[PDB]
Amino acid sequence: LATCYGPVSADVMAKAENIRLLILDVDGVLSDGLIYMGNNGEELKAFNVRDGYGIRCALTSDIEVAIITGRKAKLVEDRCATLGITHLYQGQSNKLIAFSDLLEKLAIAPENVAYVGDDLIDWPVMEKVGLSVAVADAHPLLIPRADYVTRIAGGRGAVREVCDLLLLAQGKLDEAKGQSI
Amino acid sequence: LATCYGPVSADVMAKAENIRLLILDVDGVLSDGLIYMGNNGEELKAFNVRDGYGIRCALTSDIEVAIITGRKAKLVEDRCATLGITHLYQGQSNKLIAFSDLLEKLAIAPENVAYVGDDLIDWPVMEKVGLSVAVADAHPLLIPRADYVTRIAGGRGAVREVCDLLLLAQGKLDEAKGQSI
Amino acid sequence: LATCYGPVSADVMAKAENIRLLILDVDGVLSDGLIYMGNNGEELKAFNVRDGYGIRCALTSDIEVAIITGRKAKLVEDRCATLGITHLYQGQSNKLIAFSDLLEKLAIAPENVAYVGDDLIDWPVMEKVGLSVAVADAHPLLIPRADYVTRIAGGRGAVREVCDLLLLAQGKLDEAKGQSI
Amino acid sequence: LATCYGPVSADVMAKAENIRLLILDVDGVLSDGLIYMGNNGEELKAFNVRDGYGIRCALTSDIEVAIITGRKAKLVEDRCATLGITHLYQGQSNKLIAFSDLLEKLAIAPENVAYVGDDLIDWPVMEKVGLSVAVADAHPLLIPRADYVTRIAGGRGAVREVCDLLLLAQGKLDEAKGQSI
Amino acid sequence: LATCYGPVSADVMAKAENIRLLILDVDGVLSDGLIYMGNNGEELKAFNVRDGYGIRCALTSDIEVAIITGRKAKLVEDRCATLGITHLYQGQSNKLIAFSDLLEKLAIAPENVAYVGDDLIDWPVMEKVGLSVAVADAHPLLIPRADYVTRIAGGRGAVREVCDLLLLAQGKLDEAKGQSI
Amino acid sequence: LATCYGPVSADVMAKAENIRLLILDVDGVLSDGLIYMGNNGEELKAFNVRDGYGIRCALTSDIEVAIITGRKAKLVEDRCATLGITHLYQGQSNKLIAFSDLLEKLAIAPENVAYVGDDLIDWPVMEKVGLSVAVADAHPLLIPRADYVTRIAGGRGAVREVCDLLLLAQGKLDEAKGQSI
Amino acid sequence: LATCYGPVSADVMAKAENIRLLILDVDGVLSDGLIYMGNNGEELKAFNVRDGYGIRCALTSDIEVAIITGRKAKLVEDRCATLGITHLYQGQSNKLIAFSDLLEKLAIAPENVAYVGDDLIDWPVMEKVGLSVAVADAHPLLIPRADYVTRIAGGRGAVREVCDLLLLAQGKLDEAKGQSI
Amino acid sequence: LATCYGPVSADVMAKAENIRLLILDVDGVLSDGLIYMGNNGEELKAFNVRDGYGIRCALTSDIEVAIITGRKAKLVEDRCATLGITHLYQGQSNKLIAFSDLLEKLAIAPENVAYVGDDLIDWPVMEKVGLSVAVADAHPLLIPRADYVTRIAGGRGAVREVCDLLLLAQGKLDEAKGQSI
């Protein structure tokens, strides 16, 4: 029940034991929600190396990592490459289209999927997964709907927390090896 | 009287019920008030996807959104274009001019207007609107003057908070549809 | 979904709608867990008027308030008499005997019962009730087990928080009349 | 506008200028809302010396102090005698009667009166007074209704804060004299 | 390594593994350091129920509890009797004599003893014991000397945390039974 | 320049060097400002043991401890007797008479005197003494006037902090001895 | 004595009354101390619009603004030109040289100058000016040396706070106008 | 025993006294763990001037500074050039290889080495050094393993804190010189 972020329920741990796919949102989850825009059309976004370390640990521990986001940017493709993420969907408002696509591509059951969100747009997908997750500073209306609420804020180590939770539940946390990138 | 951010007065809710136009300042409201500057003259500014979802909800729920700011940047024009904001005024030191222009263009009364500010130069317009809003971390002197002080700080989701307030007051929050962009 | 303490899940509200009996612990729930002891043999315990107002509200709005505690003190009886709590259990280490006694004396189903606890000794009862409640500053291992976690600490208005929640779910908050005692 | 606890609005300062009578609730205002009960019938309530200083200042700066509380206790009469409070009403569920009694006894208009409450039961009186005040930790549903919300919690200096505001607004803060008792 | 109060080092767990005797100070550890005094000579002190729960768990799980304190009060004997603590040393300025006697009476080595302190007077004993513990709000000069620093402050559940640590280290946590008294 | 409570100025350290007398207020300084009153006439006040330890270290290091308070209570006389304090001035609204009485009976210079206050009744004395100290939670208008401001609040170890400052400045901190009473 | 950031002493207000020149460090004062660096040699620094408004108020209200920094960047020249600052000294590791040059060029006494620093490299200049200022999050060793310590952190509104303090002291605060740039 | 960040153990101070080489991780230690990425393949990272100052102090006080990181970026090389760091290892999966290379290059024993890490990838090296340090916001599992945990978070001044600690232990802090760069 107890973790390094605090105690979690026996139900949350049992759901986490069956997770084979980890779907993430970008803005608000892998970042604090900020979009950096410039005068010459530059777009910047901050990622956390702690979350990078976690994604590497999960991908090398038989847990697939996928991303479905509403925005479309070349930088997100570059971040997926650096971490080895091959399943990526950008410009997706109705995220169930991309969700149905992953279940058909990876032949995976919805109960074996985990989703980490931060806004109300994430819920239609969170409602169908085995382990719905909302970040600490997710929109107040999403927090009570998720199976688990992270202690660490979005883009501060929230994805890492979930990665550590999935690894601990499946008995891989200590054995896990990753790159803090 | 109850919201997802905390209790509000009936006065504030009744004010928000009549709002047809939401005017926003940029620096300190849509951002955390930070101006990122570069050696080759590059300028950057950070926006929140949470605010964007709120603005996207507002514009689809028959509430116009406008922006008045003292500075001028192409990046602001891009952010407005991303969100579908068609009413934008930049390089404005007297904001009452643009305020009167919006009243004439929309055939609207000052009471149907809400204004979110963060500094003393916002007050001349806030004094005249139906709902004056100061952000959590606004200038200490502006805070006591506004009808509503937000819980969330500028650039962290304060606009979304205001958007959610206007939608709840008009019974639109439940079926509100936007994009986290 | 919206309350004055923060947003709650639909499942917590649905559970609260069918609550006809509320059971409360004393130490750490009605008080802050402190036991004032004296040289001549005095004993003191602090209660909250805010909790008193809520307890009065529930009892006048068709919700029975009962108390099960592990310590025995005359002061508890006086507080029960002031608020109108006619069902009291003191000096009870095994709380399962007192719980099954309340169900038989009032002909009530376990799903129509809500319990507010603060320690591991409270869990046996909390497992079988319809709405299990843990206070904000409850024991770390008890927090994730409960259906709902209060925002307000024990002896600071946590009982009031539950009372307000039950009244809001049953649509009795606007008509609720109590005394600040 | 600026005070030593933080800035106040020009409207609140204007409301505090007319005040001749200051009515104070006990539980949650002069105390932190705690009721200390014993096994022989002992009842204790914590008062703040800092609040006592401000009360002695108001009574010497041509401002009358009154107390209306829903509970009856001898300790309250003892505190009133220590601070020189002549007007006292206890065991009052319908506080409008004690409020109407003060208006006729002192030949004072409702706009010249100020109340400091903490719970919903205080509101019917707070509606009719010239300056309605709620403490920093007053019930969530009362806070947005008051004209002024104090920075200091109940029984921590919240009365003193109100007292300091009335003295400053009437230009008597510097020449104010009181005893820290 | 991970507990419900947060992670601890492998060395702390191994030091807590051997503990057969837990010694606690009264003021600042079992209380928040406050001494309530009266005009007629009444002396009062606050104790925490969850501390009592942990002590009840400790005594039942083959771990002796002793108390050495500098003050003398009848209420301390009353508290020790309620929880079943037989070893009590009141009016002890020099806390070395009581420590030397407890080693002789219980026939125990210094590495199987754990002391929880809060001030500089507690150090001479803590220097010799196998597990020296300082409470969260101990004197700033004692904190960096102890083997483990609690997260919970004295009189708020600090003793419980220590008890829960020893029980988990000895593997008795799941089957530990106590009373919230 | 550096203490265990944080860095202090050289001027404050030099002022604390010549200190031979330490005058303390009772309410807001030795206590947190709370006065407990019963229906029978019982009065209670809390004192911190760590605060007592510092006072004991001061008296046994050629630093006299005096007490001037606006309130009059029997319990304070008992507290002075326990801590070995011989100087007491209770029921003093005009503290300039009591301060003049200390410079005459101990034959001491104002610059060798340190005062620890909490309210505006303490400044008339503090203005003339060598080291004027305000507690962390002193009245907002007193804080800026003092030479030094404590990190710890009144009744939680504020006096101890002042005592530690005086002893280290006089180089007696390492050799100091007291009891946690 | 009263400001919108909290109470200040009569001595600090007297110092701020005579200020004609405000000297500011860049990193840690006008920014939060961060230096953004890129692979192609890009360099960014963040500034606050609230600080901008304050500087614009000072310059138009007969208070010259100067900058002395140990680093050198083109972006700083661009920021000064936007704010209308004509006195800029970059790459100065001995800030005494640029200090004496300002006193000669503007014909001004040291007591009529204010300095806002964040690290120990700022002290040699701060030691000689009429009003030395350390920011809220300045280096712990610098803080207790300054005449005034700001409530706001560097690059968050600390400069605005000082600007407001000088304007309030000189009776220019109300009449002063600026731009949120 | 006392620093400007708070008290430390004599053991930590003794370990810090021996240090001749300081090895730092970049991400989460010199920065706050954020990787800024753009659509044109730009990469930005934030460094603290306060850390830069302390690094300049270390290198001019006979304490070498080295950097080992799992990522590889040109900006880091530029940052090292600004601060005079000559020992830099990038793209380092196995940090023990770089650790072995450093000790063989500089003829230095592990006991004379300090390492400041933030994640589990740093522990293998930290296990061998004389002073292992974890930043205030390091991964929860790393914190209790280190000899010293900093008060300041990564990229906010945690590296400066370590530099200050080494200099104080070696009696160099008072006369150490650096540049805010």
mmCIF file of N, CA and C in Angstrom, chain E residues 74-149:
data_model
loop_
_atom_site.group_PDB
_atom_site.id
_atom_site.type_symbol
_atom_site.label_atom_id
_atom_site.label_comp_id
_atom_site.label_asym_id
_atom_site.label_seq_id
_atom_site.Cartn_x
_atom_site.Cartn_y
_atom_site.Cartn_z
ATOM 1 N N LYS E 74 0.908 14.846 38.851
ATOM 2 C CA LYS E 74 0.047 13.687 39.102
ATOM 3 C C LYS E 74 -0.617 13.179 37.819
ATOM 4 N N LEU E 75 -0.952 14.106 36.921
ATOM 5 C CA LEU E 75 -1.595 13.780 35.644
ATOM 6 C C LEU E 75 -0.747 12.857 34.760
ATOM 7 N N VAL E 76 0.574 12.941 34.915
ATOM 8 C CA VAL E 76 1.515 12.108 34.164
ATOM 9 C C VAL E 76 1.382 10.647 34.596
ATOM 10 N N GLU E 77 1.185 10.436 35.897
ATOM 11 C CA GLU E 77 0.937 9.106 36.451
ATOM 12 C C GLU E 77 -0.411 8.561 35.983
ATOM 13 N N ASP E 78 -1.391 9.455 35.855
ATOM 14 C CA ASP E 78 -2.721 9.107 35.356
ATOM 15 C C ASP E 78 -2.686 8.685 33.886
ATOM 16 N N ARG E 79 -1.870 9.376 33.090
ATOM 17 C CA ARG E 79 -1.711 9.062 31.668
ATOM 18 C C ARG E 79 -0.952 7.749 31.458
ATOM 19 N N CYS E 80 0.103 7.546 32.245
ATOM 20 C CA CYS E 80 0.897 6.316 32.199
ATOM 21 C C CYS E 80 0.081 5.086 32.585
ATOM 22 N N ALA E 81 -0.842 5.262 33.529
ATOM 23 C CA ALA E 81 -1.713 4.180 33.986
ATOM 24 C C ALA E 81 -2.745 3.789 32.929
ATOM 25 N N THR E 82 -3.294 4.789 32.239
ATOM 26 C CA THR E 82 -4.306 4.578 31.200
ATOM 27 C C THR E 82 -3.755 3.740 30.044
ATOM 28 N N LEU E 83 -2.509 4.012 29.663
ATOM 29 C CA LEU E 83 -1.865 3.326 28.540
ATOM 30 C C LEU E 83 -1.104 2.065 28.957
ATOM 31 N N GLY E 84 -0.948 1.867 30.264
ATOM 32 C CA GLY E 84 -0.257 0.692 30.794
ATOM 33 C C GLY E 84 1.255 0.819 30.776
ATOM 34 N N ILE E 85 1.744 2.035 31.004
ATOM 35 C CA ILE E 85 3.175 2.297 31.119
ATOM 36 C C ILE E 85 3.575 2.204 32.589
ATOM 37 N N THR E 86 4.430 1.232 32.898
ATOM 38 C CA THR E 86 4.846 0.960 34.275
ATOM 39 C C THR E 86 6.124 1.701 34.664
ATOM 40 N N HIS E 87 6.946 2.024 33.668
ATOM 41 C CA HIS E 87 8.228 2.688 33.898
ATOM 42 C C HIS E 87 8.108 4.200 33.718
ATOM 43 N N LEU E 88 8.196 4.922 34.834
ATOM 44 C CA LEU E 88 8.049 6.375 34.844
ATOM 45 C C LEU E 88 9.045 7.028 35.800
ATOM 46 N N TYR E 89 9.732 8.056 35.307
ATOM 47 C CA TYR E 89 10.735 8.774 36.086
ATOM 48 C C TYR E 89 10.482 10.281 36.024
ATOM 49 N N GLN E 90 9.721 10.786 36.991
ATOM 50 C CA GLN E 90 9.400 12.212 37.065
ATOM 51 C C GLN E 90 10.392 12.960 37.950
ATOM 52 N N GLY E 91 10.519 14.265 37.715
ATOM 53 C CA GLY E 91 11.446 15.114 38.466
ATOM 54 C C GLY E 91 12.902 14.768 38.215
ATOM 55 N N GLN E 92 13.178 14.230 37.028
ATOM 56 C CA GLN E 92 14.514 13.773 36.668
ATOM 57 C C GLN E 92 15.237 14.819 35.820
ATOM 58 N N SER E 93 16.093 15.602 36.475
ATOM 59 C CA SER E 93 16.899 16.623 35.805
ATOM 60 C C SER E 93 18.062 15.979 35.054
ATOM 61 N N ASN E 94 18.768 15.084 35.742
ATOM 62 C CA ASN E 94 19.833 14.293 35.143
ATOM 63 C C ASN E 94 19.271 12.957 34.659
ATOM 64 N N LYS E 95 19.083 12.847 33.345
ATOM 65 C CA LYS E 95 18.373 11.713 32.745
ATOM 66 C C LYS E 95 19.259 10.489 32.481
ATOM 67 N N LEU E 96 20.493 10.534 32.982
ATOM 68 C CA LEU E 96 21.443 9.431 32.833
ATOM 69 C C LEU E 96 21.219 8.329 33.869
ATOM 70 N N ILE E 97 20.816 8.726 35.076
ATOM 71 C CA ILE E 97 20.595 7.793 36.188
ATOM 72 C C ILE E 97 19.423 6.850 35.903
ATOM 73 N N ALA E 98 18.355 7.399 35.327
ATOM 74 C CA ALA E 98 17.175 6.621 34.955
ATOM 75 C C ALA E 98 17.480 5.650 33.815
ATOM 76 N N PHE E 99 18.349 6.074 32.899
ATOM 77 C CA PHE E 99 18.769 5.251 31.764
ATOM 78 C C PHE E 99 19.645 4.078 32.208
ATOM 79 N N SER E 100 20.549 4.337 33.151
ATOM 80 C CA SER E 100 21.430 3.306 33.705
ATOM 81 C C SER E 100 20.651 2.233 34.463
ATOM 82 N N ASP E 101 19.584 2.652 35.140
ATOM 83 C CA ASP E 101 18.746 1.750 35.931
ATOM 84 C C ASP E 101 17.850 0.872 35.054
ATOM 85 N N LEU E 102 17.342 1.443 33.963
ATOM 86 C CA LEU E 102 16.476 0.718 33.029
ATOM 87 C C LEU E 102 17.216 -0.385 32.275
ATOM 88 N N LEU E 103 18.511 -0.178 32.045
ATOM 89 C CA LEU E 103 19.365 -1.189 31.427
ATOM 90 C C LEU E 103 19.597 -2.359 32.378
ATOM 91 N N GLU E 104 19.684 -2.051 33.671
ATOM 92 C CA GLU E 104 19.905 -3.059 34.705
ATOM 93 C C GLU E 104 18.629 -3.828 35.046
ATOM 94 N N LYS E 105 17.498 -3.123 35.069
ATOM 95 C CA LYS E 105 16.208 -3.722 35.422
ATOM 96 C C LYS E 105 15.641 -4.627 34.327
ATOM 97 N N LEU E 106 15.731 -4.176 33.079
ATOM 98 C CA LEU E 106 15.171 -4.912 31.943
ATOM 99 C C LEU E 106 16.170 -5.887 31.316
ATOM 100 N N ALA E 107 17.420 -5.831 31.782
ATOM 101 C CA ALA E 107 18.533 -6.614 31.227
ATOM 102 C C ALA E 107 18.633 -6.447 29.708
ATOM 103 N N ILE E 108 19.049 -5.254 29.288
ATOM 104 C CA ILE E 108 19.034 -4.876 27.874
ATOM 105 C C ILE E 108 20.273 -4.066 27.467
ATOM 106 N N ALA E 109 20.732 -4.288 26.236
ATOM 107 C CA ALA E 109 21.876 -3.574 25.666
ATOM 108 C C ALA E 109 21.459 -2.203 25.110
ATOM 109 N N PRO E 110 22.405 -1.237 25.050
ATOM 110 C CA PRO E 110 22.104 0.122 24.570
ATOM 111 C C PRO E 110 21.642 0.214 23.109
ATOM 112 N N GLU E 111 22.029 -0.755 22.278
ATOM 113 C CA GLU E 111 21.654 -0.750 20.856
ATOM 114 C C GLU E 111 20.213 -1.208 20.588
ATOM 115 N N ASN E 112 19.570 -1.772 21.609
ATOM 116 C CA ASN E 112 18.176 -2.205 21.516
ATOM 117 C C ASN E 112 17.216 -1.177 22.123
ATOM 118 N N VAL E 113 17.753 -0.004 22.453
ATOM 119 C CA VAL E 113 16.988 1.072 23.081
ATOM 120 C C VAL E 113 16.832 2.249 22.115
ATOM 121 N N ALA E 114 15.645 2.854 22.111
ATOM 122 C CA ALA E 114 15.373 4.029 21.288
ATOM 123 C C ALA E 114 14.812 5.179 22.122
ATOM 124 N N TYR E 115 15.443 6.347 22.011
ATOM 125 C CA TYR E 115 14.999 7.540 22.729
ATOM 126 C C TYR E 115 14.434 8.589 21.775
ATOM 127 N N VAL E 116 13.296 9.166 22.156
ATOM 128 C CA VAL E 116 12.697 10.272 21.416
ATOM 129 C C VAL E 116 12.767 11.543 22.264
ATOM 130 N N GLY E 117 13.531 12.524 21.786
ATOM 131 C CA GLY E 117 13.741 13.778 22.508
ATOM 132 C C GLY E 117 13.285 15.008 21.745
ATOM 133 N N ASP E 118 13.397 16.170 22.386
ATOM 134 C CA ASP E 118 12.981 17.434 21.777
ATOM 135 C C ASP E 118 13.897 18.608 22.133
ATOM 136 N N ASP E 119 14.664 18.464 23.211
ATOM 137 C CA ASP E 119 15.556 19.529 23.668
ATOM 138 C C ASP E 119 16.976 19.013 23.929
ATOM 139 N N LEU E 120 17.885 19.929 24.264
ATOM 140 C CA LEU E 120 19.307 19.615 24.466
ATOM 141 C C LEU E 120 19.587 18.762 25.709
ATOM 142 N N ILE E 121 18.660 18.780 26.665
ATOM 143 C CA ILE E 121 18.751 17.946 27.867
ATOM 144 C C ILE E 121 18.565 16.455 27.536
ATOM 145 N N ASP E 122 17.924 16.182 26.399
ATOM 146 C CA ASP E 122 17.638 14.817 25.960
ATOM 147 C C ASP E 122 18.825 14.141 25.269
ATOM 148 N N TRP E 123 19.830 14.932 24.895
ATOM 149 C CA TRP E 123 20.953 14.434 24.089
ATOM 150 C C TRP E 123 21.879 13.398 24.753
ATOM 151 N N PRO E 124 22.327 13.644 26.008
ATOM 152 C CA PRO E 124 23.236 12.689 26.663
ATOM 153 C C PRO E 124 22.763 11.233 26.590
ATOM 154 N N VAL E 125 21.456 11.023 26.726
ATOM 155 C CA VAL E 125 20.857 9.693 26.620
ATOM 156 C C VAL E 125 20.816 9.235 25.159
ATOM 157 N N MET E 126 20.358 10.125 24.276
ATOM 158 C CA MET E 126 20.260 9.852 22.837
ATOM 159 C C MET E 126 21.596 9.488 22.186
ATOM 160 N N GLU E 127 22.687 9.967 22.778
ATOM 161 C CA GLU E 127 24.039 9.718 22.276
ATOM 162 C C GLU E 127 24.458 8.251 22.417
ATOM 163 N N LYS E 128 23.855 7.553 23.377
ATOM 164 C CA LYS E 128 24.236 6.176 23.701
ATOM 165 C C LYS E 128 23.289 5.120 23.131
ATOM 166 N N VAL E 129 22.031 5.500 22.908
ATOM 167 C CA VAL E 129 21.007 4.564 22.426
ATOM 168 C C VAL E 129 21.219 4.147 20.966
ATOM 169 N N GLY E 130 20.669 2.989 20.605
ATOM 170 C CA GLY E 130 20.783 2.447 19.253
ATOM 171 C C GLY E 130 20.041 3.251 18.203
ATOM 172 N N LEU E 131 18.925 3.858 18.602
ATOM 173 C CA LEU E 131 18.136 4.699 17.707
ATOM 174 C C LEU E 131 17.715 6.011 18.377
ATOM 175 N N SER E 132 18.469 7.071 18.100
ATOM 176 C CA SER E 132 18.141 8.407 18.589
ATOM 177 C C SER E 132 17.150 9.084 17.645
ATOM 178 N N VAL E 133 16.050 9.580 18.207
ATOM 179 C CA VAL E 133 14.993 10.212 17.419
ATOM 180 C C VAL E 133 14.699 11.626 17.928
ATOM 181 N N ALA E 134 14.628 12.579 17.001
ATOM 182 C CA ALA E 134 14.213 13.944 17.313
ATOM 183 C C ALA E 134 12.888 14.256 16.624
ATOM 184 N N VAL E 135 11.975 14.888 17.358
ATOM 185 C CA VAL E 135 10.665 15.258 16.809
ATOM 186 C C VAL E 135 10.783 16.380 15.771
ATOM 187 N N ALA E 136 9.776 16.492 14.904
ATOM 188 C CA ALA E 136 9.778 17.466 13.804
ATOM 189 C C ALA E 136 10.064 18.898 14.259
ATOM 190 N N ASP E 137 9.490 19.281 15.397
ATOM 191 C CA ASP E 137 9.672 20.621 15.949
ATOM 192 C C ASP E 137 10.560 20.623 17.201
ATOM 193 N N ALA E 138 11.596 19.787 17.183
ATOM 194 C CA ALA E 138 12.615 19.786 18.232
ATOM 195 C C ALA E 138 13.497 21.028 18.112
ATOM 196 N N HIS E 139 14.339 21.258 19.118
ATOM 197 C CA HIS E 139 15.300 22.358 19.088
ATOM 198 C C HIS E 139 16.247 22.173 17.902
ATOM 199 N N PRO E 140 16.448 23.243 17.102
ATOM 200 C CA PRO E 140 17.230 23.188 15.861
ATOM 201 C C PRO E 140 18.623 22.565 15.997
ATOM 202 N N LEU E 141 19.179 22.575 17.207
ATOM 203 C CA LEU E 141 20.518 22.029 17.453
ATOM 204 C C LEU E 141 20.533 20.528 17.773
ATOM 205 N N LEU E 142 19.371 19.976 18.115
ATOM 206 C CA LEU E 142 19.236 18.543 18.388
ATOM 207 C C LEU E 142 18.871 17.754 17.127
ATOM 208 N N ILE E 143 18.139 18.402 16.222
ATOM 209 C CA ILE E 143 17.650 17.780 14.982
ATOM 210 C C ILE E 143 18.734 17.081 14.124
ATOM 211 N N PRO E 144 19.874 17.760 13.842
ATOM 212 C CA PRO E 144 20.884 17.122 12.988
ATOM 213 C C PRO E 144 21.748 16.073 13.698
ATOM 214 N N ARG E 145 21.507 15.859 14.990
ATOM 215 C CA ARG E 145 22.259 14.876 15.774
ATOM 216 C C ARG E 145 21.602 13.498 15.767
ATOM 217 N N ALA E 146 20.276 13.480 15.645
ATOM 218 C CA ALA E 146 19.494 12.246 15.728
ATOM 219 C C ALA E 146 19.631 11.374 14.483
ATOM 220 N N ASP E 147 19.432 10.070 14.667
ATOM 221 C CA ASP E 147 19.456 9.107 13.568
ATOM 222 C C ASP E 147 18.246 9.288 12.652
ATOM 223 N N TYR E 148 17.100 9.609 13.250
ATOM 224 C CA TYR E 148 15.870 9.846 12.501
ATOM 225 C C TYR E 148 15.104 11.050 13.039
ATOM 226 N N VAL E 149 14.598 11.870 12.121
ATOM 227 C CA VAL E 149 13.744 13.001 12.465
ATOM 228 C C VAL E 149 12.329 12.717 11.964
#
